[PDB]
Design an enzyme around this catalytic site. Structure first.
Site, PDB file in Angstrom:
ATOM      1  N   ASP A 199     -12.129  33.714 -67.979  1.00  0.00           N
ATOM      2  CA  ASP A 199     -13.126  33.507 -69.249  1.00  0.00           C
ATOM      3  C   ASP A 199     -12.558  32.521 -70.151  1.00  0.00           C
ATOM      4  OD1 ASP A 199     -15.310  34.344 -70.930  1.00  0.00           O
ATOM      5  OD2 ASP A 199     -13.407  34.596 -72.204  1.00  0.00           O
ATOM      6  N   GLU A 259       1.637  35.230 -55.687  1.00  0.00           N
ATOM      7  CA  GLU A 259       2.570  36.326 -55.242  1.00  0.00           C
ATOM      8  C   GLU A 259       1.443  37.296 -54.546  1.00  0.00           C
ATOM      9  OE1 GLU A 259       4.634  38.429 -58.019  1.00  0.00           O
ATOM     10  OE2 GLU A 259       5.088  36.809 -59.364  1.00  0.00           O
TER      11      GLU A 259
HETATM   12  O1  LIG Z   1     -15.788  35.395 -74.382  1.00  0.00           O
HETATM   13  C1  LIG Z   1     -16.760  34.729 -75.510  1.00  0.00           C
HETATM   14  C2  LIG Z   1     -17.753  33.938 -74.609  1.00  0.00           C
HETATM   15  O2  LIG Z   1     -17.113  33.039 -73.681  1.00  0.00           O
HETATM   16  C3  LIG Z   1     -17.720  32.719 -72.467  1.00  0.00           C
HETATM   17  O3  LIG Z   1     -18.712  31.674 -72.818  1.00  0.00           O
HETATM   18  C4  LIG Z   1     -18.674  30.481 -73.657  1.00  0.00           C
HETATM   19  C5  LIG Z   1     -17.969  29.593 -73.123  1.00  0.00           C
HETATM   20  O4  LIG Z   1     -16.627  29.735 -72.777  1.00  0.00           O
HETATM   21  C6  LIG Z   1     -18.062  28.448 -74.058  1.00  0.00           C
HETATM   22  O5  LIG Z   1     -17.736  27.139 -73.738  1.00  0.00           O
HETATM   23  C7  LIG Z   1     -19.353  28.145 -74.813  1.00  0.00           C
HETATM   24  O6  LIG Z   1     -20.263  27.627 -73.949  1.00  0.00           O
HETATM   25  O7  LIG Z   1     -19.776  29.380 -75.437  1.00  0.00           O
HETATM   26  C8  LIG Z   1     -19.988  30.475 -74.236  1.00  0.00           C
HETATM   27  C9  LIG Z   1     -20.775  31.526 -74.814  1.00  0.00           C
HETATM   28  O8  LIG Z   1     -21.897  31.182 -75.273  1.00  0.00           O
HETATM   29  C10 LIG Z   1     -18.485  33.789 -71.903  1.00  0.00           C
HETATM   30  O9  LIG Z   1     -18.885  33.316 -70.610  1.00  0.00           O
HETATM   31  C11 LIG Z   1     -19.430  34.422 -72.831  1.00  0.00           C
HETATM   32  O10 LIG Z   1     -20.161  35.655 -71.919  1.00  0.00           O
HETATM   33  C12 LIG Z   1     -18.749  35.014 -73.936  1.00  0.00           C
HETATM   34  O11 LIG Z   1     -19.668  35.332 -74.874  1.00  0.00           O
END
Ligand SMILES: OC[C@H]1O[C@H](O[C@H]2[C@H](O)[C@@H](O)[C@@H](O)O[C@@H]2CO)[C@H](O)[C@@H](O)[C@@H]1O
Ligand SMILES: [Mg+2]
Length: 535
Positions: A199, A259
């Site tokens: 993530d 690993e």
């Molecule tokens: O954990 C927080 C958030 O992160 C991920 O999605 C983000 C992504 O990383 C960013 O680049 C941007 O696009 O915002 C996203 C969320 O709208 C997870 O996939 C998401 O579920 C989570 O909320």
């Protein structure tokens, strides 16, 4: 086969909306375990589970308070072990999410960290003094709204959060924190999981100098990881994420994964230049195994655009490996996002054909194999906090997170009670039961496409070479050793025609797709695909 991941198809499961077996309206692990047979019937190679760890569920899983335990709402650790064993018995690999860039504010680490400046975990998170006028240290913006800094009175200091205020970011410039997360991954690795979805993989490090981000030139293409109405798209993100040090850490992570032979990683890229970041992260064979971006998760979807994406990626490192996804828990469902103005049943088939024919690995979101459209969730049923900051210009992500339609019965057979998110009426029409024995249905098209894909090595990890097939068609060749396949796709609602750039030995039939090859002329009706064997 330690290289199963390099070209394999992974089925994403969103635990809260797959199957409720406990009658509380929320999906749980045992329901997934119950539907693993269906998942295996999809002819996929494995699964990716969205976070099921201990969480206050403010971001619904992605705000973790305990990395080494299952949240009681989804089940137990033993339940997960059972799920893992059953999935392995069906020949399915099991990948789980890893949210190590930020914890919940209820996580013991942050609870200890926020007390003062001298406690053992004071530097495990990003703390900074306010500016002389009391304002946040810089101009960094939270994706979920407001400043990326939140003031804490216990330490007289702002803490960093790229997302929710209840999601403080981990300070990766502090070695012991990095190692703590690595160990937290080693736990699940020791449990015997087959891999991790990383993530916000490029979010790990920030600029220690806390430098301001430059604004985006007005009229330029905004970042693809956020809606247009989001102020987050107004500034170029260079100091708040994607730091050089991250690369080093990736190596460390890879070493850990090394690993445990047979394991893999797929990183979620959120960057101003996503293809370059993915290519940079997945090259060298000493960092990420693969990664996915928002390039196929946004609005453009024409053959020209796909050609542009492919060309842009082929410009970069050749030893890089992409994972392609057209839907997930963060974007509008592809059947709506890409095919709202297209045929409701015909378009998703050819779109999935394209997705399954791209060079790289594939992420297939739950329900996308049924051609499920985006659900319109009313304001009073909105759960996602991201859907309460930019309303009504942006209504959040709950539309792609509505419960899975197993039957056309009450609540789609998902739950004996009213589920956490309402059941879409249209989804009942496209339910699994209605779709299980329908030869014209999207589900069987997916099964046939994946079986066909499995029978051709060139469609696993073969080279991809774009060919001139015209503007309104997507054509390329996939080659692996003995086999060379010509793949042509019609993504439009019109009949298209082209002259074959290469000579064809034979036709390769698959899933009721129809195209006519006469002489040197190939004709494809609306939403049709053509596979051929090159001489
Ligand atoms: O954990 C927080 C958030 O992160 C991920 O999605 C983000 C992504 O990383 C960013 O680049 C941007 O696009 O915002 C996203 C969320 O709208 C997870 O996939 C998401 O579920 C989570 O909320
Ligand atoms: Mg349940």
């Amino acid at each position: 086969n330690m290289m199963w991941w390099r070209g394999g198809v992974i089925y994403q499961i969103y635990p809260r909306s797959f199957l409720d077996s406990r009658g509380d309206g929320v999906g749980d692990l045992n329901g997934i375990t119950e539907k693993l047979d269906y998942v295996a019937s999809l002819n996929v190679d494995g699964i990716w589970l969205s976070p099921f760890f201990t969480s206050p569920m403010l971001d619904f899983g992605y705000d973790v308070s305990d990395y080494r335990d299952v949240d009681p709402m989804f089940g137990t650790l033993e339940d997960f072990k059972a799920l893992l064993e059953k999935a392995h018995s069906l020949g399915l690999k099991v990948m789980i999410d890893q949210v190590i860039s930020h914890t919940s504010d209820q996580h013991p680490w942050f609870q200890e960290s926020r007390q003062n400046r001298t406690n053992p975990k004071a530097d495990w998170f990003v703390w900074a003094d306010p500016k002389p006028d009391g304002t946040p240290p810089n101009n960094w913006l939270s994706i979920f709204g407001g400043s990326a800094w939140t003031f804490d009175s216990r330490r007289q200091q702002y803490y960093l959060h790229n997302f929710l205020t209840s999601q403080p970011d981990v300070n990766f410039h502090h070695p012991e924190a990095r190692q703590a997360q690595l160990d937290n991954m080693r736990f699940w690795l020791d449990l015997g999981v087959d891999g991790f979805r990383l993530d916000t993989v490029n979010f790990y490090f920030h600029d220690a100098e806390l430098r301001d981000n430059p604004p985006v030139p007005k009229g330029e293409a905004k970042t693809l990881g956020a809606p247009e109405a989001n102020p987050y798209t107004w500034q170029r993100h260079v100091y708040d994420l994607s730091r050089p040090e991250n690369l080093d850490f990736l190596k460390d992570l890879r070493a850990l994964m090394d690993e445990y032979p047979g394991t893999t990683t797929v990183g979620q890229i959120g960057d101003d230049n996503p293809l370059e970041r993915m290519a940079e992260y997945t090259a060298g064979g000493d960092k990420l195994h693969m990664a996915y971006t928002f390039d196929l998760l946004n609005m453009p979807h024409s053959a020209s655009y796909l050609r542009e994406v492919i060309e842009r990626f082929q410009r970069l490192a050749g030893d890089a490996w992409p994972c392609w996804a057209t839907s997930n828990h963060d974007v509008v469902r592809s059947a709506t996002r890409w095919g709202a103005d297209e045929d409701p049943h015909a378009y998703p088939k050819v779109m999935l054909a394209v997705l399954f024919s791209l060079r790289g690995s594939v992420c297939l979101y739950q329900g996308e194999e049924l051609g499920l459209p985006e659900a319109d969730v009313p304001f009073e049923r909105i759960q996602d906090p991201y859907g309460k900051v930019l309303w009504p210009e942006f209504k959040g992500r709950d539309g792609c997170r509505t419960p899975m339609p197993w039957t056309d019965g009450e609540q789609g057979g998902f739950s004996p009670v009213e589920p956490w998110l309402p059941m879409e009426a249209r989804h009942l029409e496209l339910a699994v039961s209605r779709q299980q024995d329908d030869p014209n249905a999207t589900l069987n098209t997916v099964r046939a496409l994946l079986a066909f894909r499995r029978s051709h090595p060139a469609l696993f990890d073969g080279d991809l070479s774009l060919v001139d097939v015209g503007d309104d068609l997507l054509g390329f060749t996939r080659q692996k050793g003995d086999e060379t396949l010509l793949c042509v796709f019609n993504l439009t609602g019109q009949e298209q025609q082209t002259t074959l750039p290469v000579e064809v030995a034979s036709d390769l039939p698959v899933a009721h797709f129809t195209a006519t090859r006469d002489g040197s002329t190939l004709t494809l009706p609306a939403y049709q695909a053509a596979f051929m064997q090159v001489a």
